Design a protein around this motif. Structure first.
Motif, short mmCIF file in Angstrom:
data_model
loop_
_atom_site.label_atom_id
_atom_site.label_comp_id
_atom_site.label_asym_id
_atom_site.label_seq_id
_atom_site.Cartn_x
_atom_site.Cartn_y
_atom_site.Cartn_z
N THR A 1 112.71 -11.36 86.56
CA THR A 1 112.41 -9.97 86.24
C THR A 1 113.18 -9.11 87.23
O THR A 1 112.82 -9.04 88.41
CB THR A 1 110.92 -9.68 86.32
OG1 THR A 1 110.23 -10.46 85.33
CG2 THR A 1 110.65 -8.21 86.08
N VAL A 2 114.25 -8.47 86.76
CA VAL A 2 115.11 -7.67 87.62
C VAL A 2 114.88 -6.20 87.29
O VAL A 2 115.11 -5.77 86.15
CB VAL A 2 116.59 -8.04 87.45
CG1 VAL A 2 117.45 -7.22 88.38
CG2 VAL A 2 116.79 -9.52 87.69
N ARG A 3 114.42 -5.44 88.28
CA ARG A 3 114.18 -4.01 88.08
C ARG A 3 115.48 -3.26 87.82
O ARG A 3 115.49 -2.32 87.02
CB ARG A 3 113.46 -3.43 89.29
CG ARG A 3 112.09 -4.03 89.56
CD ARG A 3 111.11 -3.69 88.45
NE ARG A 3 110.85 -2.26 88.38
CZ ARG A 3 110.31 -1.64 87.34
NH1 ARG A 3 109.94 -2.31 86.26
NH2 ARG A 3 110.12 -0.33 87.39
N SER A 4 116.56 -3.64 88.50
CA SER A 4 117.82 -2.93 88.33
C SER A 4 118.33 -3.03 86.90
O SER A 4 118.83 -2.05 86.34
CB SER A 4 118.87 -3.48 89.31
OG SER A 4 118.48 -3.26 90.65
N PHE A 5 118.21 -4.20 86.29
CA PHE A 5 118.70 -4.42 84.94
C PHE A 5 117.67 -4.08 83.87
O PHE A 5 118.00 -4.13 82.68
CB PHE A 5 119.15 -5.87 84.77
CG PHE A 5 120.11 -6.34 85.82
CD1 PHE A 5 120.99 -5.45 86.42
CD2 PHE A 5 120.14 -7.66 86.21
CE1 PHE A 5 121.87 -5.88 87.38
CE2 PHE A 5 121.02 -8.09 87.18
CZ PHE A 5 121.89 -7.20 87.76
N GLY A 6 116.45 -3.73 84.26
CA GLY A 6 115.43 -3.40 83.28
C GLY A 6 115.06 -4.56 82.39
O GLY A 6 114.79 -4.36 81.20
N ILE A 7 115.03 -5.77 82.94
CA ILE A 7 114.70 -6.97 82.19
C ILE A 7 113.49 -7.64 82.83
O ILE A 7 113.39 -7.70 84.06
CB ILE A 7 115.89 -7.96 82.10
CG1 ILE A 7 116.30 -8.43 83.49
CG2 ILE A 7 117.06 -7.32 81.39
CD1 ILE A 7 117.30 -9.56 83.48
N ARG A 8 112.57 -8.11 82.00
CA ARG A 8 111.42 -8.86 82.45
C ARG A 8 111.59 -10.33 82.11
O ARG A 8 112.41 -10.71 81.28
CB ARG A 8 110.14 -8.32 81.80
CG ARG A 8 109.89 -6.85 82.08
CD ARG A 8 108.70 -6.33 81.29
NE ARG A 8 109.04 -6.14 79.89
CZ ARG A 8 108.16 -5.79 78.96
NH1 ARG A 8 106.88 -5.59 79.24
NH2 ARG A 8 108.58 -5.63 77.70
N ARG A 9 110.81 -11.17 82.79
CA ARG A 9 110.89 -12.60 82.54
C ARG A 9 110.38 -12.92 81.15
O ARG A 9 109.49 -12.25 80.61
CB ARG A 9 110.08 -13.36 83.59
CG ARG A 9 110.39 -14.84 83.65
CD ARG A 9 109.52 -15.53 84.67
NE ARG A 9 108.12 -15.54 84.25
CZ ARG A 9 107.17 -16.27 84.83
NH1 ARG A 9 107.44 -17.07 85.84
NH2 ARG A 9 105.93 -16.18 84.37
N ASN A 10 110.96 -13.96 80.55
CA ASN A 10 110.62 -14.41 79.20
C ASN A 10 110.90 -13.34 78.16
O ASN A 10 110.21 -13.26 77.14
CB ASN A 10 109.17 -14.88 79.11
CG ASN A 10 108.89 -16.07 80.00
OD1 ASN A 10 108.10 -15.99 80.93
ND2 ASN A 10 109.54 -17.19 79.71
N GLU A 11 111.90 -12.50 78.41
CA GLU A 11 112.32 -11.47 77.47
C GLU A 11 113.68 -11.84 76.91
O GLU A 11 114.62 -12.11 77.67
CB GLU A 11 112.37 -10.10 78.14
CG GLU A 11 112.77 -8.97 77.21
CD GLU A 11 113.02 -7.68 77.94
OE1 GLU A 11 113.82 -7.68 78.91
OE2 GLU A 11 112.43 -6.65 77.56
N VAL B 1 123.18 -8.72 75.52
CA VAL B 1 122.85 -7.32 75.30
C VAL B 1 122.15 -6.73 76.52
O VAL B 1 122.51 -5.65 77.00
CB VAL B 1 122.01 -7.16 74.03
CG1 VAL B 1 121.55 -5.73 73.89
CG2 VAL B 1 122.80 -7.59 72.82
N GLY B 2 121.15 -7.42 77.04
CA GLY B 2 120.39 -6.95 78.18
C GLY B 2 119.05 -6.34 77.86
O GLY B 2 118.38 -5.85 78.77
N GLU B 3 118.63 -6.36 76.60
CA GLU B 3 117.31 -5.85 76.23
C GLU B 3 116.93 -6.39 74.87
O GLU B 3 117.79 -6.84 74.10
CB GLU B 3 117.29 -4.31 76.24
CG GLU B 3 118.21 -3.65 75.23
CD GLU B 3 117.50 -3.32 73.93
OE1 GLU B 3 116.25 -3.27 73.94
OE2 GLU B 3 118.18 -3.10 72.92
N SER B 4 115.64 -6.35 74.57
CA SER B 4 115.08 -6.89 73.34
C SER B 4 114.73 -5.76 72.39
O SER B 4 114.13 -4.76 72.81
CB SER B 4 113.84 -7.73 73.64
OG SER B 4 113.20 -8.14 72.44
N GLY B 5 115.08 -5.91 71.12
CA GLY B 5 114.71 -4.93 70.13
C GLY B 5 115.78 -4.63 69.10
O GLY B 5 116.24 -5.53 68.39
#
Ligand code: 3H3
Ligand code: K
Ligand code: K
Ligand code: K
Ligand code: K
Ligand code: K
Ligand code: K
Ligand code: MG
Ligand code: MG
Ligand code: MG
Ligand code: MG
Ligand code: MG
Ligand code: MG
Ligand code: MG
Ligand code: MG
Ligand code: MG
Ligand code: MG
Ligand code: MG
Ligand code: MG
Ligand code: MG
Ligand code: MG
Ligand code: MG
Ligand code: MG
Ligand code: MG
Ligand code: MG
Ligand code: MG
Ligand code: MG
Ligand code: MG
Ligand code: MG
Ligand code: MG
Ligand code: MG
Ligand code: MG
Ligand code: MG
Lengths: 159, 205, 294, 169
Positions: D49-59, D19-23
């Motif tokens: 943690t990739v700023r371009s993809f809007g994902i943080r580590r351990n997410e 998906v690329g995000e949590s929630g």
RNA sequence: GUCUACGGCCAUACCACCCUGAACGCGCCCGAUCUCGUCUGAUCUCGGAAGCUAAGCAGGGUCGGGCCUGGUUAGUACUUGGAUGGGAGACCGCCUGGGAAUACCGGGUGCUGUAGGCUU
RNA sequence: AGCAGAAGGGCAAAAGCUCGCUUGAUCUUGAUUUUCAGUACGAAUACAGACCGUGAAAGCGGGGCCUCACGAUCCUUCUG
RNA sequence: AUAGACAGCAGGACGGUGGCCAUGGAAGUCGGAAUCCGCUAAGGAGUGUGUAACAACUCACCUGCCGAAUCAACUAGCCCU
RNA sequence: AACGCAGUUUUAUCCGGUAAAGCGAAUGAUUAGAGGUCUUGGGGCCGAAACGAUCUCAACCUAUUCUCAAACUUUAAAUGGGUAAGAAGCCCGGCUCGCUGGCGUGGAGCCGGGCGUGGAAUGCGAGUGCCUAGUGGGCCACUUUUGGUAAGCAGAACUG
């Protein structure tokens, strides 16, 4: 002025030999050490507990105490102008039996045994070792062949 | 400017190479170590001449550069711009230091890098020139001129090896015919009579 | 040609192989060191361990102690020996493990003349039992379970063999936590459940379960059990008789050795002269091959 | 002719929804994968943690599951039906595996639900022959011999034999 | 002749690719009721015995890589002790003893302990 | 690769990672090592006696994988 | 090098061809590469002087007179700079 | 008519990572050419509507090649450091233990007996206590060695 660090200068001393790292072979722990025998101290870096100090590596001592994993060793340490008999505790991973004592103990049995056969046979068996005597006289056969003549070779500039 | 070369002639210090403990070393004067026809095939330049050091001293990078230019220049005049190949066999890896005394004393005297030198052994080859046999006299003469750019005594020795290879010239041709010396660009490859038999098959195919 | 060959000559030059039995994946030297090594202030007192190795078709139970030249086996019992004592099938089930453990316990104490002195639990309850030494009598034999590379989850068959030896009369330190009767939920151990596993009842319930719904799968799952005319009803008494047979005569009678003429089944090492000739032949054939082709 | 133990089979089918995000989306994506297979999936976290993809580590950014056996066989058939039983020649790895993607999950015979949404998912098929588990067992762990290995060609042929599929250049 | 279990030394045993494998074994292999554990009975645990040596494994092969060992390198490099030796020096020679390391060239390719098995 | 940090050593069914349970970082008397005068402090090694943790168990653990990370008299303060 | 050297005293040192490119000039002789052939005793794709280019001189090479050793490079001792 | 010892060798055995060497062995540094060429980029050409064809240069890989390391190393000396070369030993019998334990098992201790070829060379008589002054600026040489252009300079090792 150097540091007083307990392991200073032991980079190579406590390192494992090339392609000899990893698990400690188990015959090391299977050795039996009793009070009075002679052991060579050689610290091994794989086991960091019960390490001998660097001044005792390469030294030979006498076991005076035995515990679950370690032995108490009396080792002679030269302190400036005096030699002290230091009592150190080291885990058995860092020691091994001195083969010199084992060879001598074998010779005592052999001497004592040889003496018993010298009585029941007259003959006198030599027990004391002797320094290498001067070579006794002998003949040297040419076997027809004349000895080869050696001459120095001319100098050649090999760069 | 530079101190006179007499101040760093002798190998007095332990080797002090440019490393992570020695930063800010100026680049050596000599950068091109090979010149002439480096591509010439092993068999084109059989004759080899070496300048051999007869002292245990330090040769500065500037000294190596001057001799390289001096030998190159003459060889172009005598044999052509492509009638030979010159390789400098010393790379200046020893960093010499200078304690800059600008109007305090010997307090904190450990110097800063000044340049680089090549610690040469008695009998270590300094530079080598490979060319045709007909140009032996020029290679001695060219190497004779480059001798005046170095401190100490140097000797010019015509090698009995073939070109820049480690094989004798008098037997080099035989080994090539018997496929124990495959020409590989500048040098040759030695074919050990071992290894998979497929490699022997290709060679003889 | 893009990737640097990781398996290059320098890789092999610097490679340090692990211990041979580690390369074979047979022994865990980390656990071995803690198992077989005796305290140095006990000198030559042996440290006996019970090796239990469950195989695809057999169970091996051994008593061993460590020596420099190698381990010494003082007693070995096998599951394939159970047909002598009655059990014809299911030689790698929890019930067979208990019998093999019981057989090794009696075989050892019989060899040490300790069997009459120490009987263990003749009648199996599945409960916690620990043999205690009797004053004025030789002390109970003490050994430690060596599970090897097995995962020690509850109901592991190595604990079945452990239960057999413990009931056989060998003092082995253990807890009931890994027996099948132990409930991880209530943290409570049920002896009766253990006894059912020991007596083979879980296999008995399984065979009854197949016969009720699918007779076809019942024959597929228990074909040799059907051949040996053993039924879910007779499973308990089969093991009751086996335990009596083991406790009666646990002595191992070695198979009558029969001499046979020497026979070679595998190829011997080729001689250097043959290897040199083979290369010489290959080269000569190669040259002729180009000769005929050209 | 051929040894019965050289038969190719489905070792496992691996289904992945990144998906690329949590929630809300990951929770709903899990329900899609859960009801497609009947197995509760697991959440994969982001290693970086990739700023371009809007994902943080351990997410938690992806949902994946592994299916084996007949259940994996029948899910695979649904996937190839959507793909019309055809794959590009490059879909096959050199280790004898292949994979494909599905843009919409309701193409797999799954009823859409407004409170769930539409999702894409990734299908990876791991082939194998009997005896491949020796590389996975704890005791006497062994490495399969060179001949047992499934080459890219023998994975492509197996696809053509079983699902009479099409290989496009 | 060889295997299994547990090993000691820990490549002469490793790595790649190949050929062969009677017997017993070890395996792969079949299944998930029970024990147990997983997203997944793949792993792990458990219950088995239809099939197979395809793989593992074992033996053998390969002018194979590696490793082990020997030669060469070489009495070379280096070095103990000595000189009112040489040399402007750098350094070098000698006397007295010790004495290496590549490249290159041969040879080898696990040995063995305890217990149990198999091979008229 | 990682193991908090400087570096060096060590480590691969682990000393790394993940998970579970825990408080051996607890109470007590001596011996020993390191610096050394062979004094102290600091730190460390091997035991012993209690009381515990963990594991099926062997066993491991009285701090950190090892080599640094610390402080007398007098006084004060706290605890038995 | 007694089939005549070295020194000295004298003659030849030619044809292709002013070999190719380049250059305003480049004819052996500013530069870069090729450095081959009838003709003999020899004569070159030239060791130098020389010309804007030529020409001219000259050198190697070879012959006449001569009649025993001689030529080149390098090396290291003392001495010298 | 010898108690014991040693600024020494020998024998046995252990220790080490300097000299040297090595880099077609790890780590780091570094020169050249050669062959591959999957991919990656550039130049350029055909094609030119589209891919596409094709060549080159690099990068990259493979086999070689030049040169190096106080704070690199597979190897690896010379000199050097420890220990042992017996009577406090050996051999046999017995006893004690609350430690250890399948087992008079293991270990240790104790008691009695027996055995001198004093178990390498050389040299030397040793052991042990008390009280104790002065000193605690050093300097030089061989060889090793740090900083420095160097110094009758500054700083170490070893013996004199
Ligand atoms: C430094 C002080 C505590 C120390 C632990 C300590 O023991 C000091 C010691 O008693 C000094 C004595 C020892 C010596 O034997 N006899 C002398 O008489 C003095 C105190 O620190 C502060 O609390 C305030 C610190 C802020 C500064 C102001 C005052 C210090 C007060 C506290 C005296
Ligand atoms: K220092
Ligand atoms: K320091
Ligand atoms: K097989
Ligand atoms: K415990
Ligand atoms: K290197
Ligand atoms: K004083
Ligand atoms: Mg610790
Ligand atoms: Mg210096
Ligand atoms: Mg000069
Ligand atoms: Mg374990
Ligand atoms: Mg979520
Ligand atoms: Mg299965
Ligand atoms: Mg086969
Ligand atoms: Mg080989
Ligand atoms: Mg060798
Ligand atoms: Mg570290
Ligand atoms: Mg672990
Ligand atoms: Mg401190
Ligand atoms: Mg305690
Ligand atoms: Mg701790
Ligand atoms: Mg002169
Ligand atoms: Mg003069
Ligand atoms: Mg050092
Ligand atoms: Mg060196
Ligand atoms: Mg070397
Ligand atoms: Mg005094
Ligand atoms: Mg005094
Ligand atoms: Mg004073
Ligand atoms: Mg002073
Ligand atoms: Mg002075
Ligand atoms: Mg001084
Ligand atoms: Mg002074």
């Amino acid at each position: 002025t150097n540091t007083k660090g307990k392991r200073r200068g032991t980079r190579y001393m406590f390192s494992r030999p090339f392609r000899k790292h990893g698990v400690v072979p188990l015959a090391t722990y299977m050795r039996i050490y009793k009070k009075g025998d002679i052991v060579d101290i050689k610290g091994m870096g794989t086991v960091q507990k019960g390490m001998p100090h660097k001044c005792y590596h390469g030294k030979t001592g006498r076991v005076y105490n035995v515990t679950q994993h370690a032995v108490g060793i009396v080792v002679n340490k030269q302190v400036k102008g005096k030699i002290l008999a230091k009592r150190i505790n080291v885990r058995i991973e860092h020691i091994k039996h001195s083969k010199s004592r084992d060879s001598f103990l074998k010779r005592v049995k052999e001497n004592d045994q040889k003496k018993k056969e010298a009585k029941e046979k007259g003959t006198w068996v030599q027990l004391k070792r002797q320094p290498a005597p001067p070579r006794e006289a002998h003949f040297v056969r040419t076997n027809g062949k004349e000895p080869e003549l050696l001459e120095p070779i001319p100098y050649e500039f090999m760069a | 400017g530079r101190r006179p070369a007499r101040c760093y002639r002798y190998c007095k210090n332990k080797p002090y190479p440019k490393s992570r403990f020695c930063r800010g070393v100026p680049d050596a004067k000599i950068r091109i170590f090979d010149l002439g026809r480096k591509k010439a095939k092993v068999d084109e330049f059989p004759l080899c001449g070496h300048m051999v050091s007869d002292e245990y001293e330090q040769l500065s990078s500037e000294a190596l550069e001057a001799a390289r230019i001096c030998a190159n220049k003459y060889m172009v005049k005598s044999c052509g711009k492509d009638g030979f190949h010159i390789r400098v066999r010393l790379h200046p890896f020893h960093v010499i230091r200078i304690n800059k005394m600008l109007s305090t004393g010997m307090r904190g005297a450990f110097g800063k890098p000044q340049g680089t030198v090549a610690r040469v052994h008695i009998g270590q080859v300094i530079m080598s020139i490979r060319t045709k046999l007909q140009n032996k006299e020029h290679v001695i003469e060219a190497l004779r001129r480059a001798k005046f750019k170095f401190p100490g005594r140097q000797k010019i020795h015509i090698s009995k090896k073939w070109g820049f290879t480690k094989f004798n010239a008098d037997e080099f041709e035989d080994m090539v015919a018997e496929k124990r010396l495959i020409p590989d660009g500048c040098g040759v490859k030695y074919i050990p009579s071992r290894g998979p038999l497929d490699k022997w098959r290709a060679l003889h195919s | 040609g893009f990737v640097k060959v990781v398996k290059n000559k320098a890789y092999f030059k610097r490679y340090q192989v692990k211990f041979r039995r580690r390369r074979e994946g047979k022994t865990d030297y980390y656990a071995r060191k803690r198992l077989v090594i005796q305290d140095k202030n006990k000198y030559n007192t042996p440290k006996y361990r019970m090796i239990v190795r469950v195989t695809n078709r057999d169970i091996i139970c051994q008593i061993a102690y460590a020596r420099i030249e190698g381990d010494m086996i003082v007693c070995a019992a096998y599951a394939h020996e159970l047909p002598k004592y009655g059990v014809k099938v299911g030689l790698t089930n929890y019930a067979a493990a208990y019998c093999t453990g019981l057989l090794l316990a009696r075989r050892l104490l019989n060899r040490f003349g300790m069997d009459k002195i120490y009987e263990g639990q003749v009648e199996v309850t599945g409960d916690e039992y620990n043999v205690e030494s009797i004053d004025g009598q030789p002390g109970a034999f003490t050994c430690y379970l060596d599970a090897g590379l097995a995962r020690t989850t509850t109901g592991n068959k190595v604990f079945g063999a452990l239960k057999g030896a413990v009931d056989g009369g060998l003092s082995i330190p253990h807890s009931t936590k890994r027996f099948p009767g132990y409930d991880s939920e209530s943290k409570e151990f049920n002896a009766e459940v253990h006894r059912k596993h020991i007596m083979g009842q879980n296999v008995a319930d399984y065979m009854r379960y197949l016969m009720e719904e699918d007779e076809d799968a019942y024959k597929k799952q228990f074909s040799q059990y059907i051949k040996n005319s053993v039924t879910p009803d007779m499973m308990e008494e089969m093991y009751k008789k086996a335990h009596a047979a083991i406790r009666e005569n646990p002595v191992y009678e070695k198979k009558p050795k029969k001499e046979v003429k020497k026979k070679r089944w595998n190829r011997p090492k080729m001689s250097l002269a043959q290897k040199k000739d083979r290369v010489a032949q290959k080269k000569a054939s190669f040259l002729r091959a180009q000769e005929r082709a050209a | 002719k051929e040894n019965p133990m050289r038969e190719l089979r489905i070792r496992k089918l691996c289904l992945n929804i990144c998906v690329g995000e949590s929630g809300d989306r990951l929770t709903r994506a899990a329900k899609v994968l859960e009801q497609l297979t009947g197995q509760t999936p697991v959440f994969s976290k982001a290693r970086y943690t990739v700023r371009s993809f809007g994902i943080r580590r351990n997410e938690k950014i992806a949902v994946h599951c592994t299916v084996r056996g007949a259940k994996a066989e029948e899910i695979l058939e649904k996937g190839l039906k959507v793909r019309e039983y055809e794959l590009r020649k490059n879909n096959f790895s050199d280790t004898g595996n292949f994979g494909f993607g599905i843009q919409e999950h309701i193409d797999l015979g799954i009823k859409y639900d407004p409170s769930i949404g539409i999702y894409g998912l990734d299908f990876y098929v791991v082939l194998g022959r009997p005896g491949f588990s020796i590389a996975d067992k704890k005791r006497r762990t062994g490495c399969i011999g060179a001949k047992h290995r499934i080459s890219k060609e023998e994975a492509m042929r197996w696809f053509q034999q079983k699902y009479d599929g099409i290989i496009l250049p």
